[PDB]
Amino acid sequence: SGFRKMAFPSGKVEGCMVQVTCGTTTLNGLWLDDVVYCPRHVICTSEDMLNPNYEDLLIRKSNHNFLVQAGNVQLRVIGHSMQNCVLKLKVDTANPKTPKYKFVRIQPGQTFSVLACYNGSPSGVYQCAMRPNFTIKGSFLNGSCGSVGFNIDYDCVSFCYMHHMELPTGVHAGTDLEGNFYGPFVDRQTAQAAGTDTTITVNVLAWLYAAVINGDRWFLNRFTTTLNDFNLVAMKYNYEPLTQDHVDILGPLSAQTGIAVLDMCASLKELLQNGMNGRTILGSALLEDEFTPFDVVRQCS
Amino acid sequence: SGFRKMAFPSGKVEGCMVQVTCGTTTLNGLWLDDVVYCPRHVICTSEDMLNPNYEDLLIRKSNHNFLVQAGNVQLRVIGHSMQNCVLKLKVDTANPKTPKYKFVRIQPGQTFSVLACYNGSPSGVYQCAMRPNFTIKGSFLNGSCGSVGFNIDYDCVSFCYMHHMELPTGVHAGTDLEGNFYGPFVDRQTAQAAGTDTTITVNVLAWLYAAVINGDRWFLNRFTTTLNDFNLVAMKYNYEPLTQDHVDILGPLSAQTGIAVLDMCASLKELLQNGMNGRTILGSALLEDEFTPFDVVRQCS
Numbered sequence: 001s002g003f004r005k006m007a008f009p010s011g012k013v014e015g016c017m018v019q020v021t022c023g024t025t026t027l028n029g030l031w032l033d034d035v036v037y038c039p040r041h042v043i044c045t046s047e048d049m050l051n052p053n054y055e056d057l058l059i060r061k062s063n064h065n066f067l068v069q070a071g072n073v074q075l076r077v078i079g080h081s082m083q084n085c086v087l088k089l090k091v092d093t094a095n096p097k098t099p100k101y102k103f104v105r106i107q108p109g110q111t112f113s114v115l116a117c118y119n120g121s122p123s124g125v126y127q128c129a130m131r132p133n134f135t136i137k138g139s140f141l142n143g144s145c146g147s148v149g150f151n152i153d154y155d156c157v158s159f160c161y162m163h164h165m166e167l168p169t170g171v172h173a174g175t176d177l178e179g180n181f182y183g184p185f186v187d188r189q190t191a192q193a194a195g196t197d198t199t200i201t202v203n204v205l206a207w208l209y210a211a212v213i214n215g216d217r218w219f220l221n222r223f224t225t226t227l228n229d230f231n232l233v234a235m236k237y238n239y240e241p242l243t244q245d246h247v248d249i250l251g252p253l254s255a256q257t258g259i260a261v262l263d264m265c266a267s268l269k270e271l272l273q274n275g276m277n278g279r280t281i282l283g284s285a286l287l288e289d290e291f292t293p294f295d296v297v298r299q300c301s
Numbered sequence: 302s303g304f305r306k307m308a309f310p311s312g313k314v315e316g317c318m319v320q321v322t323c324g325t326t327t328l329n330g331l332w333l334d335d336v337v338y339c340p341r342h343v344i345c346t347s348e349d350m351l352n353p354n355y356e357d358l359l360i361r362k363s364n365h366n367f368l369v370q371a372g373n374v375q376l377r378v379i380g381h382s383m384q385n386c387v388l389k390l391k392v393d394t395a396n397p398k399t400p401k402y403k404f405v406r407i408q409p410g411q412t413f414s415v416l417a418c419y420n421g422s423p424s425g426v427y428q429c430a431m432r433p434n435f436t437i438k439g440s441f442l443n444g445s446c447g448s449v450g451f452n453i454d455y456d457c458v459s460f461c462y463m464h465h466m467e468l469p470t471g472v473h474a475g476t477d478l479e480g481n482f483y484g485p486f487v488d489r490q491t492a493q494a495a496g497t498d499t500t501i502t503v504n505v506l507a508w509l510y511a512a513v514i515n516g517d518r519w520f521l522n523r524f525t526t527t528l529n530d531f532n533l534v535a536m537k538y539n540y541e542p543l544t545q546d547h548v549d550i551l552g553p554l555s556a557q558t559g560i561a562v563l564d565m566c567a568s569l570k571e572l573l574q575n576g577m578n579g580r581t582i583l584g585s586a587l588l589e590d591e592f593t594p595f596d597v598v599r600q601c602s
């Protein structure tokens with residue numbers, strides 16, 4: 001029993017964190033095999049922030065301009081290349097701690113653990129979700145760029161995010177491990193704002209199913225709803241539209257509890273209307289949207 | 302920016318998790334140097350748990366009856382003894398992944414990271430506080446007994462908790478690493494309940510400081526109070542009394558934000574008496590009490 005926002009054990013990722021220095025800028029790097037991945041903005045100076053020409057800045061660099069430090073040991077850069085917004089530093093040693101891994105680009109609503117790092121040394125681990133507006137509500141201070149987001153599927157580490165910047169609203173933007181940003185963000189210091197954020201409807205529904213599984217039914221009602229009437233209501237509360245894919249994904253949770261997906265949608269329409277009336281669901285006075293249907297099945301079974 | 306429930310990186314502790322089997326019972330053990338630590342109830346069958354005699358059950362067990370699995374390697378138990386509610390299995394091999402460590406007993410209100418495991422395999426990590434009633438609000442399913450709690454100071458792991466049981470209200474009970482229970486609990490399958498819990502006042506105040514550091518200032522006011530006046534409010538709303546040691550501990554946060562502890566107490570007094578009135582603090586409609594002053598300073602500075 002109990003429902004916690006649980007992160008993946010960070011160990012397999014800790015053994016990959018290194019410190020990358022270029023000039024006066026120091027950030028984090030991901031050392032997998034003989035390659036260290038990091039935000040390409042590490043090659044920018046006070047002058048190269050509004051309109052950096054990365055290709056021009058990079059052609060002027062030699063391997064010895066990059067200082068990579070894995071723990072106390074200095075790694076030797078033997079090659080460098082750029083792929084989208086990530087810099088790939090070829091090193092003279094393959095990381096002996098390289099776990100089984102893959103790079104995966106996630107979609108909004110997906111959750112992942114973040115190992116926040118400073119100077120290539122891990123600080124903390126926390127659970128995150130990719131918001132519908134392609135930002136993440138993380139916890140990052142200056143020097144955390146290059147910190148990564150991941151999931152662990154049995155023994156395989158799925159790297160899904162690398163930290164690049166904090167937007168003016170205090171939210172975070174980054175790329176997948178191939179350097180492609182999530183959202184319409186760019187690695188430039190120009191004015192860019194996150195779009196309006198919405199609630200991940202499929203995740204709230206899954207967490208309401210997690211509440212039923214752990215013995216709570218106070219919020220259920222005797223009504224049902226069509227998929228279209230649910231969306232007409234939910235979108236008035238800034239909820240993401242619920243698709244037939246979402247309805248299908250909740251199928252196993254619906255079968256476990258005996259409550260149809262659209263009966264649970266009717267209970268969510270009522271919760272939005274009445275609030276909680278001094279009650280909590282799974283120890284929360286708000287409707288939680290950072291637990292996916294997959295996380296619910298994996299945590300509470 | 303950003304404030305997240307953050308756990309210490311669990312890598313140093315993952316290298317210590319082993320599976321321990323005794324008959325049908327399989328649970329988790331902590332392998333430090335040449336000793337595996339685990340709950341002493343591993344020797345009990347379901348009938349033995351009704352009223353166990355551990356000294357009697359242990360003398361009738363021999364080294365070969367304990368199956369210790371470290372990954373895919375069998376560890377040979379060469380000795381077995383008991384310290385309070387913890388069973389110590391001396392093994393033939395020292396753990397080469399043993400970090401710099403200490404066994405420490407924490408106080409209620411202090412926080413720690415839990416590495417939840419199943420058959421010596423870590424599955425997740427989460428941060429939690431030792432409740433004033435000595436229980437922990439964790440997330441555990443069958444097979445998690447022997448999962449440990451810890452803090453990391455520099456490169457030293459301070460082990461403080463080992464999971465033993467779940468209480469009928471969903472909360473969890475366990476011991477320090479020397480087998481002494483936190484709370485009035487016994488490792489016997491009998492009617493045991495968690496006492497009435499209270500809110501950790503110094504932790505709520507620390508979290509209000511983190512809210513102010515992150516730009517959430519709506520709850521601040523021109524008023525101040527006294528420790529004596531505030532404690533009458535605390536007692537009424539089931540909050541732990543605020544001592545002078547708590548005000549002293551909050552000193553750096555008072556200085557960094559310009560809001561005295563009794564100035565922040567007048568804000569907490571108003572949130573307790575009048576509520577949040579549709580507003581949230583750090584995306585929460587409840588006053589969060591599982592961040593210590595130190596956790597806030599560590600994450601914000």
Ligand SMILES: [Mg+2]
Pocket residue numbers: 521522523524525563564565567568
């Ligand atoms: Mg005040």
